[PDB]
Symmetry: C3
Subunit: 276 residues, 3 copies
């Protein structure tokens, strides 16, 4: 057997990414996620100080890109392409992923490049498939050609970000133009006036909107649902998203934190367990 059949299918979605800033020359790969919107994902540090981000496809179509946004902590960034006809790959679930699963790291450093290995450990994915500068921000796929992760930069040891997590950050960037991680597996956003009155609240109302609560995280289990609004963490008032990361990070691990929330006009309070 071989992987050629299934890599043939993965290939088209993998792009090359050249960056020029200040003169600067950066090169990495990227994966097309939504061809009907022209959306691709690559590493965050590749497009750092980016002045000219140029994407080259498989068919050689050189195109210019628009950084919708990027995330530091996962080293991920999202770009938009204003083009059509694009093809993507079949994408899988990183939840089904187990150590021992075979794995291939693809990229496009020039004008392909695939390395084989397995998953070594399992919030990134460790692998003995050889990742490179040329193929960071590229596609890590399973033995079925399903996209299970995005390559990053760091030995004999590679790391990728599980595509579930990857897609979660891209969406926040797509829907909000940004991404802000608060406490214990939740994502928060600035509760703008227009967002406030989109949720039945007053224009003058302030807080940190919870844009997503990851399942079985301490906050989900502390009872915090998405669409809630934090106004106070302990004896400190909250009025923007960045304050959550700030307030939380200034409290020792495993501490009881009383956080006032506001779910559908009713104020609550949630006792929560701080995680490092």
């Amino acid at each position: 057997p071989s992987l050629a059949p299934v890599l043939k299918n993965a290939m088209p979605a993998i792009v090359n990414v050249a960056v020029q800033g200040y003169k600067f020359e950066s090169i990495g790969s990227g994966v097309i996620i939504d061809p009907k919107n022209g959306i691709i994902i690559t590493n965050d540090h590749v497009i750092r100080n980016a002045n000219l981000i140029t994407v080259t496809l498989q068919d050689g179509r050189r195109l210019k890109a628009r950084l919708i946004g990027g995330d530091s902590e996962t080293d991920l960034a999202v770009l938009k392409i204003d083009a059509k006809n694009l093809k993507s790959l079949v994408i899988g679930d990183s939840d089904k992923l187990e150590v021992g699963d075979y794995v291939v790291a693809i990229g496009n450093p020039f004008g392909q490049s695939a390395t084989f290995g397995i998953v070594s450990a399992l919030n990134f994915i460790q692998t003995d498939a050889a990742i490179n500068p040329g193929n960071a921000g590229g596609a890590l796929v399973n033995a079925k050609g399903e996209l299970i992760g995005i390559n990053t930069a760091i030995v004999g040891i590679g790391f990728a970000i599980p595509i579930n997590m990857a897609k979660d950050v891209a969406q926040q960037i797509i829907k909000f133009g940004s991404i802000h991680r608060g406490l214990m597996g939740i994502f928060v956003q600035h509760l703008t006036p227009e967002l406030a009155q989109s949720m039945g609240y007053a224009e003058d109302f302030q807080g940190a909107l919870v844009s997503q609560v990851n399942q079985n995280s301490p906050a989900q289990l502390a009872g915090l649902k998405s669409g809630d609004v934090i106004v106070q963490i302990n004896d400190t008032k909250i009025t923007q998203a960045t304050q959550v990361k700030t307030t939380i990070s200034l409290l020792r691990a495993g501490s009881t934190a009383k956080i006032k929330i506001l779910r559908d006009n009713k104020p609550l309070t949630l006792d929560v367990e701080v995680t490092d």
Copy 2:
């Protein structure tokens, strides 16, 4: 396909090993061999100058260990655990091993870590599976999850000790509290007074007991069986096990060596061919 099914089964037997001496901090992995006795094997240099050897299991049970003994030349050491409920892995035969066989190097450097490759050459096993400090003394297993070797430290090139050989040294350590390799594939031991009269000899009788003769080695083929007793190698008398390695090492390769033995009360003499 994948290896997850079979690595799931291997995992429980793999331990983490933390060592403190003189302040010193050493970390490696190890494999549980006999759960009904609490016996684990790891690398010898990990527990060097060991003052505190602490073992952490899969279920997180941190336990203290007792160095039964260790071997330098194979870089192997044996530890005892005074605990119950333990599970081991399925263990194979290193004789069935051939170059080309797939292979996975597992360890437990933190709190898993598995790398894939094949057997490169075949008295250790060379492999392109990536071994590390974190995963030396850990389990090398075949494509069937059978334990075929123990990882060691040294590139793109790893080495393991064939589990047959590994089990042979552990047993000597278990049965005798030590291990001494004499000439051409044989293992010798101090013929203590209590051992002498356990074999029908006199209390006052002296020699180097042969505790094991490996099959098809020059000494087996020179006719030397286990349970024999060397009293003289050439014109030099023998009275303890260490003298065999000493006497033999001082003779050029492929030399004729006349060794008086004593098998069941009858003295013999064996013409033997020195191997480097």
Copy 3:
């Protein structure tokens, strides 16, 4: 499964190659191509400044070798052995090769050594199978044990020369005692007097014989067939094979080049597109 069955079959054809010159000591591997003629191939730089090239087989038969010739650009060289009984391997087609295909790099650095990986990219073959000094000039084989390439020296990244190309250069060396690469995928040779009158031409006739035109190359598509004879490239006369590489290299990429040829007594002219 495993690869042992199929590596067993490959092994015999793989040789060790030790070189002594000026004191010099070089070591690499090589593959037996034609056992009925005693022909082996290895890397070119291994037998550089070679004064004593000694080959050792699998059965340990140490034999002396005769450098028929070698090629720099592909880093390949051909040696002859004046011996019998030899066995070779099953050899494949590098055209069927695709990225994702599994792959094993074998050699004989001592007295075997095989590493596993896939084809990474595709005029050499890139692979994440680990090549070494010890195993350069050795056999890269597919998952079927078919010889698909010859290992070379250069990271996490190996390179081999597709066996089709490899066999093409060896034959030129075998048939002509040399190899000279002209323009855009063609091979040229000195049109010696004896060769001239072997092709119906006069003894006094001069030019650069085309000893092979690779399919779908610019020159094939420019209409140039093997067995033709170049006498002029542009306004410059041609009288030996080395002049083609010389003339061509002194013209910018993608230029129109008018080359007088002489196919079966009739002069032509061929408009050709220069490739870098």
